[PDB]
Design a protein around this ligand. Sequence first.
Ligand SMILES: Cc1cc(C)nc(SCC(=O)Nc2ncc(Cc3cccc(OCc4c[nH]nn4)c3)s2)n1
Ligand SMILES: [Zn+2]
Length: 291
Amino acid sequence: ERLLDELTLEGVARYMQSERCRRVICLVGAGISTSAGIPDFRSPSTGLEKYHLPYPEAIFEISYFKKHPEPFFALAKELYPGQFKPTICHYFMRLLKDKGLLLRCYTQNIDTLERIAGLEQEDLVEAHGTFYTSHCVSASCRHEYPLSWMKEKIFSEVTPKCEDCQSLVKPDIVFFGESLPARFFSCMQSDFLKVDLLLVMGTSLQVQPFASLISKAPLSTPRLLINKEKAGQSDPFLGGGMDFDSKKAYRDVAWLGECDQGCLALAELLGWKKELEDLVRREHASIDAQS
Ligand SMILES: Cc1cc(C)nc(SCC(=O)Nc2ncc(Cc3cccc(OCc4c[nH]nn4)c3)s2)n1
Ligand SMILES: [Zn+2]
C-alpha cells in the first residue's frame, strides 16, 4: 500500500509528478555546498593555534566570543568564501519553489547560498543560523546589521561594534551555548503535518536536533537521500531511522553519489533538465559578472 511504486530515483520522480505529491520538505547540509567551494568544517580533511585559545572549542562558544571575540573574527576572515555561487542542488530547490512544490527548506548551512539561489525567508529554516544578518548582542538594543556591513568589518579586521551602543555585533549563527532558533521548532511542528516528500541532500544526519527531523515525517511519507554515503539508519549500538534495504523497506530511497549529480538526475527524470540548466547558467553568469 506504499506511495512509491519502486524504491528508486525513478519511483520518486513518478511519485513527484503524481497528484499525491504536492508538498516537499528539503533537509540540506554541508554536502550541498562543497561543490560551491565551501568546505564542511566537520569533514576532517577540511576541518588554529595562531589563535591562542584556552581550549580549542572556545572559538565556537558564545561566552568566550562575548569576552574575546577577536579569534572568531580572524577565523571568519580566514574562512570567508571567495565567491558565493549556489550549486545545482540550490537551484533545484529554487525550481521546486517556482513550481509550487517547496513547503520548506531546512538547512544546516550558514553560507547564505539558499538565499542567493532565490529561496526567501519564508521558505527557509536556517537551523544553525546564518551569516546573512548580524545583531548587536545587547538585549536592550539588538540592532540588526546586514552581511555587507559585517563583511566590511571582517575584512578590515575591525571588531564589529554596534553604532548605537558599542556592544559587540555577532553574526546570526548559532554558537555553542546558544539555543537553536525558535523558528526551527515552530516550523517543524507545523510543516511535518503537511509533507508529502522528504528530500534529504548533503547531510550525514549526525548533528542533533537536525537529524531527528527525519523521524517527524508521517509514516507514509517517502524519504529520498541524495548523499555521498548512506546516512540516517539506526545505529546498531545506540539504537524512525531510514530503512533502505531490508525486506520491510517501503518508502526510503538512497541515491549515492555527488549531490549535484543526483539532483541533476532527478530533474532530468522530471523533465526539468533544460529549465535547471538555463537557470543555473543564467545565475552563475550573473554572479560571475558582478562589478
Ligand atoms: C565567514 C563566512 C561568511 C559567510 C557569508 N559564509 C561563510 S561559510 C564558511 C565557514 O565555514 N565560515 C565560518 N566562519 C566561522 C565559523 C565558526 C563557527 C562558529 C560558531 C558557529 C558556527 O556555525 C554554526 C553551527 C553551530 N553548529 N553547527 N553549526 C561556525 S565557520 N563563512
Ligand atoms: Zn547595540
